[PDB]
Design a binder for this molecule. Structure first.
Ligand SMILES: NC(=O)c1ccc[n+]([C@@H]2O[C@H](COP(=O)([O-])OP(=O)(O)OC[C@H]3O[C@@H](n4cnc5c(N)ncnc54)[C@H](O)[C@@H]3O)[C@@H](O)[C@H]2O)c1
Lengths: 499, 499, 499, 498
């Protein structure tokens, strides 16, 4: 099959306490290629005991200090060498990801560029701020705040952008001096396995980094609830996130949650019309709409609603579907039969509550798409804010279209959801765009663009799209804890109690 | 009775959406003075629907923008007007707090001075950091982060220092423009009711501040679990904390937890001895040990242990118990019969597992204390880290004493608990105190001192003593949320999808 | 006037080392009211030995540490007391400023409000940052940066906005713990004398604050050149600033300079026309253009140029000149015969090089303005960037009008001067306003507004408009110096040199 | 000996992307201080070459190819220079030792530091664009954007040519400024090399420029030209005063890093052997030609005599020789003029009643006669009123003074026009900290001497300078703030009659 050579030397095992090792029970898992449903690889399926052992090794390593007591400058140099290795093997990593997740090759190349930059950013931030000096309000005292690594941290990622979500958590952890245990989505472990071999070549002490492979239903709880864990950085669906928070509570453990969204793409009548159409398509269908920042909820002003529906619909009929390795492919398949069915059930929900499937809504007929997990890019019209298809995250190549009369009605509709991750506003009137952006309860607002995000700036949600932040200085602040040391430079007896 | 004048004009009601109102079911509760167990006041015992009403009132107010959109400079002027009212009524407040909680009048004066200072600090911080500008990695884009108020916030406090703990939550909330709903310990609401009366006089838009009165076992779940709350700031026991975090997870709601501690007080043989004895007494018996920062776990170096034990014990026999208002009084009563019962049960625990009650460990015998909730300052010896009396937070006028041979052993013991709030180190060798300070997993560390904490510096725990911080800039950030606004100054079509 | 009452209790003396004292040689100076040219007051004219003595007192005090070593919190409380003194006495101060400088009362009330806010802003910034903790690249070392008060600072202000300019220097100086010696313009000392009376009431240690009254030509070289001066903060004309810098080099003394401006006011054809005219007038004739932030150089797009000129000209004819105390007055007189003379000489220079005096250009003939130092609001047309009238600062009620075709041309002209203090831009296309603002070499840029400046943000020049900043956090940093204290926690011999 | 390095080294200046000769074809011979022999010949630039350089910097800066490049990319480029320093570590270190005469091990320390300086600023490039202010005016957005200052001129001394050059180049490039640099006329070698290296990395035409020449011929143009936005100068105080004065003609910002009279304070409760070791190190590394040298030793009276005895006895054993020999502990001083300047101070010291306890002259040994060597010296029986104690000698010389108490030590240490760096030795850390706080110095070392790194700012209090180098503060010298205030609901004032 295609991509076969990339897998010839990849590890099938987990990585615990400095060694590549199997599952405690030698159980394994088959890895699927959503383009043809062929098994392409077989990796270990760790037990909860393996996860426990990894966590304990992380703690043991953290306490020894080899990495936590290493200078911030040096840690930065090592995070920077990881970055150099991403770029060195950019070609192989990009394919590996396309093969595992199904997105076009061009999309996977874009990630290796971001990933390189993500580690590169944190490598440079490592030695830039160790805390602060406070002007004490008590005479003859010195007051200071030192920032230390939180300790041991568990990192859990989703299947849509595996190595990308991994790097967002890995970079700051290592930059701060923490020891980490990571578990990628059970269905997309390929690139995460590669990066560990890469980090291993860079050289880290035994137990600083550990990789667990397995179902979240079996090892997850261990990772969110073990008492030696100080931080749990999770990226995934909301329900799994609530589970995690409640279990983390058993030992009052900090969390950082990066959940889903119902991201609005607000289009005013004075917008660059062809740009708005270009970006609606992009927002709704890159990686088959399996993107947490996908613009699945299009809000379009009534004056141009009709025209907008026609243009969008006509462009969607031309979207090329195929293998990610094919140069023509604009949109790939969805990740699994489970996920595909999930999306299919949403078409029945929509139809049954009053919405119109304007186009798509089914599997591709074609002779060259029948064997893959493809689903037609779709547009839903005649829907409103009370419908489940509009309120809930479908996480597929689906978008809804709602109209608004005014600027107030646009904000009202965009903020009318449990989520608050990201969104955009298209308009040539920047004063109006800036007004709107200020009233939107979103972690990230794009004015006349859709998708841009980078290490220099924090990413995360308002409301139920999350807790905490990733990337930028705040992304780093998650892996740090503050200690206030107050010295009394002229101690004196208080003499409150009798003598 | 002694403090009658203080209550002849005090309100007995809840404060919701600009009005002083009773409970939904006219239910009420009696508040007592722990020095004599006399009922001194009757207030409303509100319901969960009242709580829901407050939360909704705070939500409306926040969305109207009357406080949330007020300039940060003006918000700061009003927080400063509150600080001014604390100082203006300083006398009456300290007396009120002492009447309700039993602590000495001098301690209550100290609180009032800190409360003024807290509001003043945050009044002063309101307008200094609106967020940042990012040098964007994408040409022709403007990247910026704006810091916004988090929204509606619920604030829950303990009975030990009611107003002090309330100030730490109210000040930053207002400073940032959030709407708040507060509920103090059901047994100590007097000073909290008072400060609401004073914040009313300062002047705030309807629904911006709200006071709920009632048992947390009845109205607490609403304040932690309602979908409209954006943050729950909690200061109390660990189990209530875990219960709250699990509940807040139902709507992925931010939590800030300030829990208890098992604070070590380390005393080296090269420490100023009379200084150590003085601060060990203060650390152990201020407010009868009903203090989250109490130095309940004394670690003394073996070469001076016997000498230390007898001095400490000799001084404990001389501690003057009595009424808070009386100047000669050095230690007051404990808060309730339930809490004294809990402390009595710990003496039996200590004895059952092999420890020695070297002094105290019972009710005082004197005739004038017979009616109050007094319990003798106690010193427990011949104990170790495997015992419950050493591990668990007694929160009474009780300290345990353990020995250590070396520097490595003092630290090991100090970190051998699930907590990590605060601690102290006593030694004339400042290099050594600093080494030790750095390995101590505590939020705050005192070198040759015990207790100092002020608005200028963050406070909170490592491990299970908490999540997040109060005071300082970190404290302010719990009430703020970051939004990244990216503008494409030269938007261009991507043309990924076929035309 | 009703304002001669303001003066019956005002000090006529200098303030040195805690005492109100006369000149060393008892010399005096007569102060003038520009509306009628009458001598309203008489004060001490200090000698160069009085200045030397003031600086020596400020040094003595700084070293004793009564103020420099006081807590930052307490310093902030005092700066806050001064701010309250400004508000209490707002009325009297505003009248006094109008009496002394000729501007309207409405303008002086505005200054007093700003002034209050300046002291308040800095009171609150005082205790917010004492330095940083650095993560050292050398093992077994601690690295911290402490911010200290820079020491003794001399402060020199201009005659246009005496107290305002003084507030900008005093506030951070006292907040950071420095010692200051101030000298206001010799012709406008009234408000400055008053504010020293007020600062004395709040109470500061002897030496901390010092007031010298006198001609810069006599005592200025001592304030810039004495070796005990650590910083020299000057606000005045460019030629005096150059002289000062050169003098400060004798002892490598730090400098902060706020010089003049040739501030452009850019008006695109897509601007709100009536807003543009309103603002062009305001920027042009507030305080008879005797403003360092005055929009003297109007740049207007060609397509609306004729229409704009005519519109501006018609409005200028109606400007009402008179007494600053009369409510009908829109623009008062200029400061002195000398200053008026300078402006007049500028009308000749303009004419001889080919510009047109489209309106104004002379003293008003009117009967009630006859005895005053008035000068008609003027508009100069048919001018270009090579002309002196356009390149140089007139500092009068005069503006030059120049056309531009494109966006690049406006940017090129706006930036074609030796200056770079401030500027504005008017256009309904906010996108375009941002592009322009980015390319203007100016410390402050206004989009659709003119004159806004406040304590929360830094003010100062680019190019020859100055060195350093005033206001905001950067304003405070002028009064601080950094110290890297590096401690070696495990000192070891190097053994480079033989035994 | 180290002939091989120079074989392919450029002899010319670098202006507007071309390696070019002086306008008047003039040249200058470079010397190896160990043997006073001519090792290389370079161009002697004119002041018009300097004016041409500056005008090129201005053009490039305005064209925006570097000033408007993303901060992230600029950072990657600074990192590429960092890497070339490591790549050529060996050569550069031999080259610095050949030109300046210090030991090879010192030159290695420099290159490691130089790598880390570039690396640090490469990492700081994109971390802070400015800030959002909470405007007190309703319906207004307020933001402070940080922009590159403009054209910057950079001038360095002969003691640590490349080290001092790196402290200026790194932040300039990182922020997007354009530059024109001039090294000391006698030590231009490694600076010419670092330019050949920067050229291989790639920067647009005009961004970086190198002028070669005497400060008394081209220096005024670099401090006084009106197109210059900032003057970053590291050198002597007197030159410092001159430059500031000239820079004032166009109100041009300046950063000054000047000399010091750094105190090395030793209390009786210090680790005695640790204090003797570090006193030798602070006084004689690079033959005391270090801006951070501990030339003013202050020792508590109770151990003063003991310390003098020990120090002197150790100074007598200091190995003098060729910087290329592993045995050499101290090399020669830089030039004939600098050695005579030090000799004249010996006369001054003896004339004012001080004692030359040991050293104070050239060494006679046959193999050291052809080099610019001067014996490590120790001057006793002196006081704060004397010149030997108040002025920067910059030779291998120390002065020893006694102090009875903590206050007297503090008083003497601050009793100079300077305030750059200093040390405090004592096992009592509490005491070291009270002292550190009261010393008016840019950097204070507790129980150590010399540490300084990119992570923390370096500069002086009092007359040791204006501004800072290194750390975030050193970057801020190359940036200027712009307050952009937008009114989002403008309304007419209607002050003036319609
Ligand atoms: N906020 C963001 O930055 C962001 C980015 C990408 C994706 N997402 C979201 O992530 C989701 C991706 O889908 P997914 O199916 O991978 O998410 P998921 O919630 O199904 O699972 C994600 C990860 O959690 C693990 N897991 C499952 N149960 C667990 C448990 N009890 N304890 C611990 N771990 C457990 C899974 O094995 C997997 O590794 C989408 O909703 C998308 O919106 C968010």
């Amino acid at each position: 099959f295609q991509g076969m050579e990339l897998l010839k030397h990849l590890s099938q095992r987990q990585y615990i306490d400095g060694e590549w090792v199997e599952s405690a029970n030698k159980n394994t898992r088959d890895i699927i290629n959503p383009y043809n449903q062929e098994v392409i690889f077989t990796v270990s399926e760790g037990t909860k005991e393996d996860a426990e052992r990894a966590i304990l090794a992380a703690r043991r390593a953290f306490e020894s200090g080899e990495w936590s007591q290493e200078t911030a400058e040096t840690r930065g140099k090592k995070v920077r060498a990881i970055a150099d290795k991403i770029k060195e093997h950019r070609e192989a990593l990009a394919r590996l990801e396309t093969l595992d997740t199904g997105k076009t090759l061009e999309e996977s190349y874009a990630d290796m560029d971001d990933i390189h930059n993500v580690f590169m950013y944190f490598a440079g931030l490592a030695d830039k701020d160790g805390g602060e000096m406070i002007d004490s309000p008590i005479p003859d005292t010195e007051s200071k705040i030192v920032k230390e690594p939180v300790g041991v941290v568990t990192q859990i990622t989703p299947w849509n952008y595996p190595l990308l979500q991994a790097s967002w958590k890995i970079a700051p952890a290592l930059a701060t001096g923490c020891s980490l245990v990571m578990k990628p989505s059970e269905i997309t472990p390929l690139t995460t396995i590669r990066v560990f071999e890469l980090m291993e070549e860079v050289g880290f002490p035994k137990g600083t980094i550990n990789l667990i492979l397995g179902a979240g239903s079996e090892v997850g709880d261990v990772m969110s609830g073990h008492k030696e864990v100080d931080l749990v950085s999770f990226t995934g669906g909301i329900e799994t996130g609530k589970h995690i928070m409640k279990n983390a509570a058993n030992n009052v453990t900090n969390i950082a949650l990066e959940l889903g969204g119902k991201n609005p793409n607000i289009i005013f009548d004075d917008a660059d019309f062809e740009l708005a159409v270009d970006q609606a398509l992009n927002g709704g269908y890159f990686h088959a709409g399996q993107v947490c920042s996908a613009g699945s909820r299009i809000l379009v002003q009534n004056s141009i609603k009709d025209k907008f529906e026609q243009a969008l619909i006509d462009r969607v009929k031309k979207i090329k579907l195929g293998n990610g390795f094919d140069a023509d492919t604009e949109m790939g398949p969805v990740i699994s039969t489970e996920h595909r069915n999930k999306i299919e059930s949403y078409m029945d929900v929509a139809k049954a509550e009053g919405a119109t499937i304007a186009v798509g809504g089914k599997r591709p007929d074609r002779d060259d798409l029948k064997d893959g997990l493809f689903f037609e890019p779709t547009v839903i019209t005649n829907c409103d804010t009370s419908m489940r298809i509009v309120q809930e995250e479908v996480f597929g190549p689906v978008v809804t279209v709602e109209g608004f009369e005014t600027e107030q009605e646009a904000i009202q509709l965009a903020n009318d959801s449990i989520y608050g991750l990201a969104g955009a506003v298209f308009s040539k009137d920047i004063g109006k765009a800036q007004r709107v952006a200020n009233k939107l309860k979103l972690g990230t607002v794009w004015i006349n663009d859709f998708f841009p995000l980078f290490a220099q700036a924090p990413w995360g949600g308002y409301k139920q799209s999350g807790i905490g932040r990733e990337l930028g200085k705040e992304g780093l602040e998650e892996y740090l804890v503050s200690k206030h040391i107050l010295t009394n430079t002229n101690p004196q007896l208080v003499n409150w109690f009798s003598k």
